[PDB]
Design a protein around this ligand. Structure first.
Ligand SMILES: NCCCC[C@@H](NCc1ccc(-c2cccnc2)cc1)C(N)=O
Length: 426
């Protein structure tokens, strides 16, 4: 019936003076734009159909053409930035916001998904959607005593859209909008559906990706324990953003980091630091690098939870990018830790994997490792054990790497390598 029409025939129907013919042609267009192999979006746009679709959004009298045009538009709006812009310039944002309160669930849901793709395209459109007033009617869609009474796909859609209103930076979303959305987000964060939980976590990871002030806004709603719980989930799509969110939070103050530790997060890290998914291992190690950059009492908790051996593990063998994160975790630990904490670290075997990484063709990790070696010597000085440390390093072939670093291209490494040779290796 409306299957494989040409653009020319769609234009003919949409331009006819017959609502039924227009509906028929709009559905044809929706099916065209839904096809999997290269949907002819730009031809639809060139034909001038977006303004017509938009006007159809306002036909309260004919709910089927509201739905088909909403769907056609949503297909276009999920495309490139240029294609999304074409939809916005057609006046679609307020028309979609009007449709949020539609008595038809299918139409309301279509409006939710359209606004999510528009807002998700970038900071400016996100903020434009907020300015047109989308948040109140979106939130009102979730105003029921129990989320479990809503349709599943409906809830997932609302959650996904809410997370796009939280999503980009330069600038981050308006403080007022974040505060308006955060309580609904906290509620969705305890909802038992894996996809809703994943998208709520993504939303929280966006909101915590910024200065300590924005971290505090989230942390003050009390979500850190639920985030830590989700950190232990079995679904990787949940774990990934829960870990991103935790990672962001420990870039904050000592107090904000302490909330993560108090919630029990460290006990999840033996499995995260040995996780089969490379990016989970890398983000867990980055997270550890920010915790070892904290207070000595926070370093001590890392020690107590048995995590130092796992850091030695990741330094010894991991994806290189992960090894780089572990190098940073070690330099931060040695820069801030007590003498006893540094001694313990050497007792766990850090020296040989640290020296082995001096072979890396990566200038910045070399400085990180050299600084770390210097920090450990500084601790050995206060105990008069610089010589025993020297021999350790010399036994595992560390000297060879260091006397070579001497020769190589970089500013600071040259300077750093000489100093160590001159001062601790006769
Ligand atoms: N708990 C937050 C501490 C923030 C300040 C603290 N940040 C330390 C730090 C420094 C560098 C990294 C880092 C650098 C590069 C790659 N991965 C991690 C991580 C943490 C510092 N400058 O000593």
């Amino acid at each position: 019936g409306t299957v494989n029409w040409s653009v020319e025939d769609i234009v003919k129907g949409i331009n006819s003076n017959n609502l039924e013919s227009q509906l028929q042609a709009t559905q044809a267009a929706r099916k065209l734009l839904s096809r999997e192999k290269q949907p002819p979006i730009d031809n639809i746009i060139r034909a001038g159909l977006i303004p017509k679709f938009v006007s159809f959004l306002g036909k309260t009298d004919c709910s089927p053409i509201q739905f088909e045009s909403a769907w056609a538009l949503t297909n276009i709006a999920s495309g490139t930035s240029e294609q999304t812009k074409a939809v916005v310039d057609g006046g679609a944002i307020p028309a979609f916001i009007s449709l949020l309160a539609s008595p038809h669930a299918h139409i309301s849901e279509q409006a939710v998904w359209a606004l999510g793709n528009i807002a998700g395209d970038g900071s400016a459109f996100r903020d434009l959607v907020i300015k047109h007033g989308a948040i109140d009617p979106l939130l009102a869609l979730l105003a029921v005593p129990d989320l479990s009474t809503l349709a599943c796909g409906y809830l997932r859609n609302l959650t996904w859209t809410l997370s796009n209103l939280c999503r980009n930076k330069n600038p981050a979303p308006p403080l007022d909008a974040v505060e308006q959305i955060l309580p609904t987000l906290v509620r969705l964060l305890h909802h038992n559906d894996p996809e809703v939980l994943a998208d709520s976590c993504w939303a929280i990871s966006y909101l915590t990706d910024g200065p300590n002030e924005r971290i505090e806004m989230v942390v003050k709603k009390g979500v850190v324990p639920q985030l830590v719980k989700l950190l232990g989930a079995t679904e990787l799509p949940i774990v990934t953003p829960a870990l991103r969110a935790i990672g962001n939070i420990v870039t904050g103050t000592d107090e904000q980091t302490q909330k993560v530790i108090d919630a029990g997060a460290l006990a999840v890290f033996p499995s995260l630091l040995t996780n089969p998914k490379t990016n989970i291992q890398k983000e867990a190690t980055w997270t550890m690098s920010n915790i070892t950059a904290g207070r000595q009492d926070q370093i001590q908790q890392v020690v107590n939870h048995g995590l130092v051996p796992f850091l030695v593990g990741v330094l010894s063998k991991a994806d290189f990018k992960t090894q780089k994160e572990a190098a940073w975790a070690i330099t931060n630990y040695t820069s801030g830790g007590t003498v006893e904490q540094i001694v313990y670290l050497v007792h766990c075997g850090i020296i040989e994997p640290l020296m082995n990484l001096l072979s890396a063709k990566d200038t910045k990790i070399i400085q990180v490792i050299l600084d770390a070696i210097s920090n450990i010597f500084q601790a050995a000085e206060k105990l008069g054990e610089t010589e025993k440390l020297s021999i350790m390093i010399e036994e595992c072939g560390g000297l060879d790497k260091i006397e070579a670093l001497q020769r190589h291209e970089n500013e600071s490494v040259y300077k750093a390598s000489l100093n160590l040779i001159e001062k601790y290796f006769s």
